[PDB]
C-alpha cells in the first residue's frame, strides 16, 4: 500500500560549503571519475622515502644554513663575534633584486604559514679550520635581551657571568651544536612579520630589528644568542691563514610547535626581476 508517512520531521541547515576551511570532516564534492569511490592507494615508499615528508617534525628539522662569521688573530678576550635573535623567521637576501623583506629560509617559509610559534631551536656552529689553529670561544644565550644590549660600547660581552656558557676548545673540537629553550611568559610567541617603517597610508615594509628586547619586540623572539671570543685565534701565520670562517645552521627542536594557520607571511613565485 501507499501509507501515510510516520517519519517525523527533522530540522535542517542550508550551507553552501561545509568544511571548506577545514582539514577535518567529510567533503561533499561530486567526483569526476566514473567510480564515485575512486581513490588511489597511499603508495609506500614514495619519492625514495618512507619517512613522512609533509610532517612539521620532518620539515622544521631540516637544517637551514643562515649565517656565518669570522674568528681571527685580531679577535680579543670577551669580544663579541656574533649574535642572533632567537626566533624562526630567519631570512636571506634575494639575489635578483634588493627588496627589504628578503628571501625566507625554509624554516621561515614554513613557519610563515602560521601566526603562533613555540619551542626550542637547534643551532649548529662549524669552525672551518685546521688543527694548527688554537683558541677558545664561549657560546652564550641571553633570554629577554636584544643584540645591542649583550655587548657594551666596546663590543665586549656583558654579564656573561649570569648565563649558560659553552666553552669550545679549538685545539680539539671543530664543530658544536646546541638547543636553545623556548623562554617566554607567554605560552606562544608570534612569527615575526615585516613592519611599516613609513607612516600610514605610506607603506614601506621592512624586516624587524631585534637590537633590543622590550614590549615592542618581546613577543616575536625569546632573546639573543651570542658567541663571544675568549682567546685570539693564535696560529702560525707562517703556514695557515690567521682568520677562519664559522658557519651557523639552525633547525627546530623536538618540542617545537606552531599554530593558528592563516594568511601566510611568505608568498612564492616562479621568477623575480627588476622592473624595466
Amino acid at each position: 500500500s501507499k501509507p501515510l508517512t510516520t517519519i517525523p520531521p527533522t530540522i535542517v541547515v542550508q550551507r553552501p560549503s561545509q568544511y571548506f576551511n577545514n582539514a577535518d570532516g567529510v567533503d561533499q564534492g561530486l567526483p569526476l571519475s566514473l567510480k564515485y569511490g575512486n581513490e588511489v592507494i597511499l603508495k609506500t615508499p614514495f619519492a625514495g622515502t618512507s619517512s613522512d615528508e609533509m610532517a612539521l617534525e620532518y620539515v622544521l628539522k631540516i637544517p637551514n644554513y643562515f649565517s656565518r662569521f669570522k674568528y681571527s688573530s685580531t679577535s680579543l678576550p670577551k669580544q663579541v663575534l656574533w649574535t642572533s635573535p632567537v626566533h624562526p623567521q630567519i631570512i636571506r637576501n634575494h639575489v635578483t633584486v634588493v627588496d627589504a623583506p628578503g628571501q625566507p629560509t625554509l624554516l621561515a617559509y614554513a613557519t610563515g604559514f602560521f601566526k603562533y610559534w613555540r619551542g626550542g631551536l637547534v643551532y649548529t656552529f662549524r669552525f672551518v679550520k685546521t688543527n694548527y689553529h688554537s683558541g677558545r670561544v664561549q657560546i652564550t644565550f641571553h633570554p629577554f635581551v636584544g643584540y645591542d644590549d649583550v655587548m657594551d660600547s666596546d663590543g665586549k660581552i656583558v654579564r656573561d657571568e649570569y648565563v649558560y656558557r659553552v666553552v669550545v676548545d679549538l685545539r680539539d673540537q671543530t664543530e658544536a651544536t646546541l638547543v636553545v629553550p623556548f623562554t617566554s611568559l607567554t605560552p606562544y610567541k608570534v612569527c615575526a612579520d615585516v613592519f611599516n617603517s613609513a607612516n600610514r597610508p605610506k607603506y614601506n615594509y621592512e624586516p624587524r630589528d631585534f637590537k633590543v628586547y622590550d614590549n615592542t619586540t618581546d613577543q616575536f623572539f625569546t632573546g639573543t644568542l651570542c658567541v663571544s671570543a675568549l682567546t685570539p685565534l693564535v696560529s702560525s701565520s707562517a703556514v695557515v691563514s690567521s682568520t677562519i670562517d664559522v658557519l651557523v645552521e639552525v633547525k627546530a627542536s623536538d618540542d617545537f610547535e606552531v599554530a593558528v594557520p592563516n594568511t601566510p607571511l611568505w608568498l612564492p613565485v616562479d621568477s623575480l626581476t627588476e622592473r624595466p
Binding site: 633570554p143 654579564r159 657571568e161 648565563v163
Partner: protein
C-alpha cells in the same frame, strides 16, 4: 642552610599609613602594587639574574588602636590594575561597596590588632616580567569602611608587613632587573 626563596619569604615592613578621624567612608588609605611595593634592594639583589618570577603574596596589616577607639577597615585585592577597564578602577574609588564585593578581609580595631590576606599570582603572563616590567599582577588596597570614631579628633598608624610564598623563578639572564 640558606636559599634565594628564604629571602622572598622574608616579611618586610612596607609602610606606615595615616588614618585619622576626618577620613571618611571609602577613603583610600593606600593602594600598593604587586610586585612593586615589595621590590626592596634586598629582594632586587636576589632576584637579579632572573628573567621573571611568580608568587602568592602575604599581607599583614597592623593597627594598634587603644580600647576607646572604634573603627573599621577593609583590605582588598584587585588584579592586573594597570590594564583593568577604567570604569572598574573608578567604581572602587567611587563606592566602598564595589570593594566589599572583592576578595577582601575586614578589620575591626576594637577586636583585632591585626589581620592577613594571601593573594595568588593571577595573570595572562605566567610570571611577572622583571625586564619589561609588564603589568604588576595585582594590588592591595585599604579603603576605610567605617571611619575612626574617637570623641575628639585623632589619628592612627596603619602598618603593613608582607612577603611572598609559593615562589617560582624564570630562566636566568644577563638582562637587568627593571628599575
Amino acid at each position: 642552610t640558606h636559599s634565594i626563596i628564604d629571602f622572598l619569604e622574608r616579611p618586610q615592613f612596607i609602610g606606615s599609613f595615616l588614618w585619622n578621624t576626618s577620613d571618611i567612608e571609602n577613603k583610600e588609605i593606600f593602594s600598593l602594587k604587586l610586585p612593586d611595593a615589595l621590590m626592596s634592594p634586598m629582594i632586587r639583589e636576589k632576584l637579579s639574574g632572573f628573567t621573571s618570577f611568580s608568587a602568592s603574596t602575604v599581607f599583614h596589616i597592623q593597627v594598634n588602636a587603644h580600647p576607646f577607639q572604634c573603627g573599621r577597615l577593609v583590605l582588598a585585592a584587585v588584579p592586573v590594575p594597570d590594564i583593568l577597564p577604567l570604569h572598574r578602577l573608578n567604581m572602587l574609588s567611587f563606592d566602598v561597596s564595589n570593594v566589599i564585593t572583592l576578595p577582601h578581609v575586614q578589620l575591626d580595631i576594637s577586636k583585632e590588632t591585626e589581620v592577613l590576606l594571601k593573594i595568588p599570582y593571577v595573570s595572562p603572563f605566567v610570571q611577572y616580567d622583571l625586564v619589561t616590567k609588564f603589568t604588576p599582577w595585582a594590588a592591595f588596597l585599604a579603603h576605610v569602611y567605617a571611619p575612626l570614631n574617637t570623641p575628639s579628633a585623632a589619628s592612627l598608624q596603619v602598618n603593613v608587613f608582607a612577603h611572598f610564598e609559593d615562589i617560582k623563578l624564570g630562566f636566568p639572564t644577563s638582562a637587568i632587573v627593571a628599575q
